[PDB]
Design a protein around this ligand. Structure first.
Ligand SMILES: [Mg+2]
Lengths: 58, 51, 714, 526, 103, 51, 52, 51, 51
């Protein structure tokens, strides 16, 4: 509630860099979202630990 | 397996009784029609007017 | 001279001109051949075939039950259900031996299906015997009513949303000591009614088949559904089966089997084909046999899976058959007619009934419990077709030369109802011995082949489920000519469906070019008559004729107007696949084009995606442009639910706030009401921000939303 | 407003409130299947009956403000009534026609854009070319074929996501807001449909129809392309045929060839590698095919080849329990066999270590230019049937079948050494070497294979060793059908085992696939 | 082949000015077939003097083999609605165009 | 038959609780190419309260 | 479900889950809820320790 | 001829569907035509409908 | 949740884990398996389906 009244997704564009607000995603699910600050993605996650545990098992 | 060769089959026996009677909805070969060759009269098209 | 078209079969072989031996093109308009007496005959004959078995008394319903399994070997050629469990197990063992891993993979796929399925699937069935109201009702309404009763009886496993959860709920219900049914009186004033059912009454209601052929209740839908999934999985991997393939694959299967059996035959081997039907399929299929074969199929499997698959035959083996409406009594002296329900048939004198009905009632009285007859042996149609096909394919596969140990050997298909064997052997003595062995083995397994309906001729010609094979040429008449009349959805939908069905018949149903042209002509005439959309120029004086005439007198490019607006038909074998509005889009006048396609017209309605540009008949999909001519026609029209439309009312007003709900199954963890509340608050805020809404509406909306919040919290 | 007031009314009652608060949005669509109405049986009769009424068409309240009560002839267009279950006023077809002839007009600029598929059909027909009909016996082999050209071949999930972003901008799921690849097509469509008044559900359905792939099992006798299937009624008949060509635009992609080459390279370079499994996995996880990771294509594309099949087995998935040998997709149909290892001395004094199947098995083979069946006993060829368009297809198919049989008769019929080595200089297994050797020349084997007479029957003809039709004599168990044989109707996908050597072994201990069976041909990456 | 190898600007073929009264797509298909056949030749070792293209639908359509009227005696085609003498009609007049001067 | 049943059903729907007189009419094209109308007979329909 | 687990997660984590369960003498094809739970467990574990 | 009969909605619909009979007849002759064409590799509409 | 709300990671990584699990939940639900998954959890162990 502190971040302010929920916003519609179409109006998220006004958010400042790294500002966090409340938006309605899905078919009526209000969640707190933020803009990204670190230029990464979900693909590279687990790769380092993947190779580490692969070495450990073998 | 019973052999079937040119002699076994027989005709199908019809039921006996009185002759059967017509049951069609309408007359087929005994109908008569009152004709108008060209319906060019007023208010044409309505079945009652043509009749 | 007397016309006698049957003589035509002296030049044109029967198979080539078989179209002449099929009288009707469509459903004959009488739909007769069913009644309570028929159910009595079925019960009596089923218990007759199995009479020599053991007689037992069930401990729950108290009804007598029959057990022909492992009975004495048949001594005569009359139909006998005295199947042996050892023999069916050996046959299944050989079938697995010749197709290793089929049972296992089928079991894995069935396990997946069990895990992922949902409750709402049971709303896709046909007319169902709602036990709660004790009458036939739609699948959807019957399921809603059963859910309501279970909820009122403290059973809400199905609330999770899984079919197996509903099965566990039924499990809980049938062990319950008493069931309470609540009903409303909808006018004049409304009241309430409560009814209490003991354990035995509800048990009997669960194991009942309302006969109208028969339909079981929601209790026994899921188990048969899962057993059918298993049987379909097994059959999909069998070459000799005949299900669940379509029209095109049947011809390929027939050709494959016939070529395999004929070409492999050497110059010194004689081949024969037996086109055959089964004496009485569902009246000699003991449920115990299916239970034994399912036990063999699900060897070395999770116990829960084995039990879920074994419930269905267990449930069916102690089933009850209802006796329909009853009987009608007429007195000529006073021209007085009355209806006697079948319930009292147990305790009514035997003087109002003719001799045949007297015999039926005398035979069926000892088996009558609470107005329902206990039919342990035998089965009903439309439920265990695939498992029976599996058993037939097993006995066929037993014919491989290795098993027979002798020169003769057989093969062929099996589609449950009918079949086509093929036997190879050195001499006619070998053919006779092979057919004798096949017949005796089918008898031992408990299968009777109709000796009258089955005939044997040298390989090259046969029939199989209305597919006539003659020296390589296969003629298809399983469904015959379809319905070329307007289906009756709306203007555009009917036009598209008609053209598409003509096209599909041309592609698949071997229809001709001239035949297609004539079908199109007939369809367009029928369409124009039905929808009062005759040509703007022509004078036919219908209700719609004046406005069409005004439109025609208004436009300029009269070749562009739709058929339903008074325009020429422009279809042909060329453009059957082109939707109408596109096919003449270029010719359309600017003003007519704008009006016809104005999306703000009040006559256009779109339903959920599953019912958009698709019609249920099996179902078919059609292409059309959503124009003003896409309207929807008017609808025509003891209940547990107080308001039958509560669910429909609830789903609506979800589409409003969330239109996407109509397109894709919406997913979310928040309850619905909070979803509408948040969406409404956001929409009202943004609406105020824009300037199209004033302060009073904002205040009203927020007060209302707060009040809804308080109402839902409490 | 109307919506919130209706929600308040629903909440007022106890049962509606209970259903609202209890059911989660996840199960919303479950309570959409609880319809208490009754489906109308025989809707054609119902429509015939309905059309006779005065007001059989249902319109909405707003119609009261635009269409007057009566027209010039004082006919009644709409009636002050309501439908059973809603406030849909009742109107007659007169209302529809009056709207068409005198209703307000707009611009249908977006209709061609939303309906690009149908207008594409129109254009393809409008620019086609025809040719003389030919009357002759028609053979329509049955197979799977595309339906709708112009599709992007996207998975249903991807099409749903694209539609949701395009027409439902502020109602998109969490996956999109936690997604990076904003497909170019999505932005293209968003720009195209800026100001579109069409019903959004119609737009969504049309985009779904436009961007999805569909396949059907049909008998065809000529061209199989997607644009050649939409006119199959006009093109092929039972006794005739029609020369036709669509005149639009074809969108034949090439990603399949690129995937073939990628998988072939991966297997060829990993077979010699120390740890082929983990190595191939790392490659497939980090490789891009035309801007898209190869994992998506592997999971999506229905390709069937030895390299891709072994890749799936390593990664872990289901593949057909069959092998494409000698350019022909094989499939077991009946019987069972046991694999036994043996040493065989050929006619060139060459010793080969082979594994032969013993049993009364039956197989069906479907090639690019032929279709065949083969019943084989324990090291004994029993029956062989082939059908093909050309004699060369017949010969190559029969050579493939006989080498597969692995009978002892042909072993003594080998002439010349069998030392074939693939382009990688890796020794080829004996059966492939024999296949290539018999491809080079098989006349000697034909002369010394087997000859016996055959009874004459319709629909099938024999073959002499010089590969010519014959009715009075043929080779042992060798025959040709004058009518085309329909391909296999179904395929069985079963759990299989993969070893580090990239050999796929069935659950019974037999081997299914090997890298050595992979063709070593080189292509170009489009 | 050597002259072709000197160019590397190949794109995906597409039609800019289509043949109004003709078969546009099959020209593209046969051009693609030509390029693929040249690559296949490149993949060969003992290239013969000349290589004959395999018979393909697009090849026949572009050539005109599948558009060639068949042969039948006048007895069996006399009763045709649009059976006319060959179009020995004077071609329509065409105005002078400046492109021949530049040619 | 087509005309008979079409008129019957249309009158049944339009005239629920009346006795309607339905002429049996047909149309035809003579050798002279003239629109001829033929009257086979009449039909009288009872109560049409059909559900 | 099992197919969904195989497709949605990194295959290596699937291998680790398979080994961890096989340590207990279990077959994922008979039990998949445990398989999915273990796959989620390993995924969250490796996510926690990543990029630090 | 006066008679009393009864008709059901299904029967009226089946009556209005009688025109489909036309198609049936053609579907049995065209095949024969086509059949001979297959054995002759040429059209046979004229040599059947005019011979 | 965590002890004392002393979440070791920064907001970014916590958001990443939250969002990965949220997307997994949405995909499981859309695939019709979320209910069974949530059910099988019994305290601190996952149990096989029993019938
Ligand atoms: Mg039969």
């Amino acid at each position: 509630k502190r971040y302010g009244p929920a916003l519609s997704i179409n109006e998220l564009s006004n958010l400042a860099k790294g500002e966090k607000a409340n938006v309605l995603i899905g078919q009526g699910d209000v969640v707190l979202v933020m803009k990204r600050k670190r230029d990464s993605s979900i693909l590279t996650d687990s790769q380092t630990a993947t190779k580490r545990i692969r070495m450990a098992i073998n | 397996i019973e052999p079937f060769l040119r002699t076994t089959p027989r005709p199908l026996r019809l039921p006996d009784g009185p002759p059967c009677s017509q049951r069609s909805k309408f007359l087929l070969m005994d109908a008569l029609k009152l004709s108008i060759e060209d319906p060019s009269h007023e208010g044409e098209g309505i079945p009652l007017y043509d009749a | 001279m007397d016309v006698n078209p049957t003589l035509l079969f002296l030049k044109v072989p029967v198979q080539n001109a078989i179209s002449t031996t099929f009288p009707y093109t469509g459903d004959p308009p009488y739909s007769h051949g069913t009644g309570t007496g028929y159910t009595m005959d079925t019960v009596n004959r089923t218990h007759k075939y199995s009479e020599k078995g053991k007689w037992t008394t069930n401990t729950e319903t108290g009804a007598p039950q029959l057990n022909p399994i492992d009975g004495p070997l048949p001594e005569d050629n009359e139909p006998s259900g005295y199947a042996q469990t050892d023999c069916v197990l050996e046959a299944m063992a050989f079938l697995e031996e010749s197709h290793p891993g089929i049972f296992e993979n089928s079991c894995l796929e069935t396990m997946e299906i069990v895990q992922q399925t949902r409750v709402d699937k049971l709303t896709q069935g046909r007319q169902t015997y709602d036990w709660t109201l004790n009458r036939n009702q739609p699948a959807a309404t019957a399921l809603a009513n059963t859910i309501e009763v279970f909820r009122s009886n403290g059973l809400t496993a199905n609330e999770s949303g899984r079919l197996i959860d509903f099965l566990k709920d039924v499990m809980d219900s049938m062990d319950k000591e008493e069931m309470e049914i609540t009903t409303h009186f909808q006018r004049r004033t409304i009241g309430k009614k409560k009814q209490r059912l003991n354990k035995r009454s509800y048990l009997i209601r669960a194991l009942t088949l309302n006969t109208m052929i028969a339909t079981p209740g929601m209790q026994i839908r899921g188990f048969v559904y899962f057993v059918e999934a298993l049987a379909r999985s097994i059959c999909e991997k069998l070459e000799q089966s005949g299900l669940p393939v379509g029209g095109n694959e049947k011809k390929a299967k027939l050709a494959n089997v016939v070529r395999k059996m004929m070409t492999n035959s050497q110059d010194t081997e004689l081949s024969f084909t037996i086109t055959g039907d089964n004496t009485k399929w569902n009246e000699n299929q003991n449920p115990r046999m299916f239970l034994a074969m399912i036990t063999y199929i699900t060897r070395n499997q999770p116990e829960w899976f084995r039990n879920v698959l074994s419930i269905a035959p267990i449930m069916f083996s102690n089933k009850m058959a209802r006796l329909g409406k009853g009987y009608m009594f007429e007195s000529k002296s006073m021209k007085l007619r009355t209806q006697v329900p079948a319930e009292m048939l147990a305790n009514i004198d035997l003087k109002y009934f003719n001799k045949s009905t007297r015999e039926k009632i005398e035979k069926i009285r000892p088996l009558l419990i609470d107005g329902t007859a206990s039919l342990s042996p035998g089965m009903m149609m439309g439920m265990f077709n695939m498992l029976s096909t599996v058993l037939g394919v097993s006995i066929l596969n037993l014919g491989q030369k290795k098993y027979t140990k002798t020169t003769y050997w057989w093969d062929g298909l099996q589609s449950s109802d009918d079949f086509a064997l093929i036997v190879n052997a050195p001499n006619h003595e070998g053919i006779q011995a092979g057919v004798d062995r096949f017949y005796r083995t089918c008898k031992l397994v408990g299968i009777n082949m109709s000796k009258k309906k089955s005939y044997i001729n040298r390989t090259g010609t046969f029939e199989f489920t209305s597919f006539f094979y003659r020296y390589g040429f296969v003629a298809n008449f399983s469904m015959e000519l379809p319905s070329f009349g307007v289906s009756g959805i709306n203007e555009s939908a009917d036009m598209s469906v008609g053209v598409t069905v003509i096209k599909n018949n041309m592609i698949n149903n071997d229809l001709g070019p001239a035949t297609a042209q004539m079908a199109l002509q007939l369809f367009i005439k029928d369409y124009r008559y039905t929808y009062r959309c005759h040509r703007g120029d022509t004078q036919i004086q219908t209700r719609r004729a004046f406005e069409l005439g005004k439109l025609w007198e208004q436009t300029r490019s009269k070749a562009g107007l739709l058929v339903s607006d008074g325009g020429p038909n422009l279809y042909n074998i060329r453009n059957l696949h082109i939707p109408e509005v596109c096919l003449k889009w270029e010719l359309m006048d600017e003003d007519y084009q704008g009006r016809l396609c104005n999306p703000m017209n009040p006559f256009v309605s779109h339903k959920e995606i599953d019912s958009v540009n698709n019609a249920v008949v099996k179902s078919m999909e059609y292409d059309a442009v959503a124009t003003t001519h896409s309207w929807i026609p008017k609808r025509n029209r003891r209940g547990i639910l107080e308001d039958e439309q509560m669910y429909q009312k609830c789903c609506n007003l979800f589409e409003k706030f969330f239109p996407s709900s109509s397109y894709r199954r919406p997913v979310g963890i928040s309850s619905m009401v909070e979803a509408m509340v948040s969406r409404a608050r956001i929409d009202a805020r943004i609406d105020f921000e824009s300037g199209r809404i004033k302060k009073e509406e904002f205040a009203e909306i927020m007060k209302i939303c707060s009040t809804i919040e308080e109402l839902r919290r409490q | 407003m109307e919506r919130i007031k209706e929600l308040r009314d629903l909440m007022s009652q106890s049962r509606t409130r209970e259903i609202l608060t209890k059911t989660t949005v996840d199960h919303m669509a479950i309570i959409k299947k609880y319809t208490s109405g009754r489906q109308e049986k025989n809707p054609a009769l119902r429509m015939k009956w309905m059309m006779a009424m005065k007001y059989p068409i249902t319109a909405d309240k707003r119609i009261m403000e635009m269409i007057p009560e009566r027209n010039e002839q004082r006919q009644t267009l709409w009636s002050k009534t309501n439908d059973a279950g809603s406030d849909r006023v009742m109107v007659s077809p007169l209302a529809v026609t009056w709207w068409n002839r005198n209703g307000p007009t707009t611009s249908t600029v977006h209709y061609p854009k939303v309906y690009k598929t149908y207008f594409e059909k129109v254009e393809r027909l409008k620019h086609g070319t025809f040719g003389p009909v030919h009357f002759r016996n028609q053979v329509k082999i049955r197979r799977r074929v595309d339906i709708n050209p112009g599709h992007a071949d996207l998975s249903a999930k991807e099409a749903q996501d694209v539609i949701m972003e395009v027409v439902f901008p502020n109602e998109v799921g969490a996956r999109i807001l936690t997604s990076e690849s904003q497909l170019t097509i999505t932005k293209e469509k968003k720009k195209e449909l800026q100001d579109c008044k069409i019903a959004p559900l119609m737009v969504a359905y049309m985009l779904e129809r436009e961007l999805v792939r569909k396949t059907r099992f049909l008998p065809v006798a000529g061209g199989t392309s997607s644009v050649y299937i939409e006119v199959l009624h006009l093109t092929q008949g039972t006794c005739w045929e029609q020369m036709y060509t669509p005149g639009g635009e074809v969108r034949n992609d090439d990603v399949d060839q690129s995937l073939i080459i990628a998988a072939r390279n991966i297997v060829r370079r990993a077979t010699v590698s120390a740890d082929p499994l983990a190595s191939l996995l790392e490659m497939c996880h980090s490789t891009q095919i035309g801007g898209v990771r190869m994992v998506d294509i592997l999971r999506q594309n229905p390709t069937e080849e030895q390299a891709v099949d072994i890749c799936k087995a390593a990664m872990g998935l289901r593949i057909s329990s069959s092998f494409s040998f000698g350019g022909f997709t094989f499939k077991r149909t009946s019987g069972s066999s046991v694999k036994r290892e043996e040493e065989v001395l050929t006619g060139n004094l060459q010793t080969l270590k082979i594994r032969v199947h013993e049993g009364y098995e039956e197989f069906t083979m479907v090639g690019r230019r032929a279709t065949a069946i083969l019943r084989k006993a324990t090291r004994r060829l029993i029956q062989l049937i082939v059908s093909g368009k050309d004699e060369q297809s017949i010969a190559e198919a029969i050579i493939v079948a006989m080498v597969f049989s692995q009978e002892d008769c042909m072993i003594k019929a080998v002439r010349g050494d069998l030392n074939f080595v693939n382009r990688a200089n890796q020794r080829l297994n004996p059966m492939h070497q024999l296949l290539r050797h018999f491809q080079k020349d098989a006349k000697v084997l034909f002369q010394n294979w087997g000859i016996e007479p055959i009874d004459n029957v319709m629909g099938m003809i024999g073959i002499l060793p010089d590969m010519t039709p014959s009715t009075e004599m043929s080779l042992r168990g060798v025959r040709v059908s004058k009518m085309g044989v329909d391909e296999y109707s179904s395929t069985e996908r079963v759990v299989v085992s993969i070893d580090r050597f990239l050999r796929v072994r069935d659950q019974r201990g037999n081997v299914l696939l090997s890298p050595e069976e992979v063709s070593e041909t080189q292509g170009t990456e489009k | 082949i050597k002259c072709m190898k000197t160019f590397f600007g190949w794109k995906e073929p597409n039609i800019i000015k289509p043949h109004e009264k003709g078969i546009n797509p099959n020209y593209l298909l046969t051009w693609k077939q030509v390029l693929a056949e040249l690559q296949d030749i490149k993949n060969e070792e003992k290239i013969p003097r000349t290589k004959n293209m395999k018979k393909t639908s697009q090849l026949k359509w572009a050539l005109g083999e599948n558009m060639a009227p068949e042969k039948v005696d006048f007895e069996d085609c006399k009763d045709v609605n649009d059976l006319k003498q060959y179009d020995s009609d004077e071609p329509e007049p065409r105005s002078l165009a400046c492109w021949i001067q530049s040619e | 038959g087509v005309y008979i049943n079409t008129a019957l059903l249309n009158a049944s729907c339009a005239a629920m609780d009346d006795f309607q007189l339905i002429p049996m009419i047909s149309k035809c094209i003579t050798k002279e190419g003239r629109r001829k109308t033929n009257l086979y007979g009449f039909i009288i329909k009872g109560r049409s309260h059909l559900r | 479900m099992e197919d969904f687990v195989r497709q949605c997660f990194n295959p290596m984590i699937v291998e680790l889950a398979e080994k961890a369960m096989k340590e207990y003498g279990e077959d994922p094809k008979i039990e998949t809820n445990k398989f999915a739970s273990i796959c989620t467990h390993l995924e969250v574990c490796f996510m926690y320790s990543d990029f630090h | 001829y006066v008679r009393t009969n009864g008709t059901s909605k299904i029967k009226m619909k089946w009556g209005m569907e009688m025109r489909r009979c036309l198609l049936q007849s053609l579907q049995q002759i065209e095949s024969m035509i086509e059949a001979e064409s297959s054995v002759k590799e040429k059209d046979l509409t004229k040599e059947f409908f005019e011979n | 949740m965590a002890t004392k709300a002393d979440y070791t990671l920064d907001e970014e990584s916590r958001a990443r884990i939250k969002t990965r699990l949220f997307t997994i939940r949405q995909e499981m639900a859309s695939r019709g398996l979320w209910d069974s998954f949530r059910q099988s959890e019994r305290g601190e162990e996952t149990i096989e389906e029993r019938f």
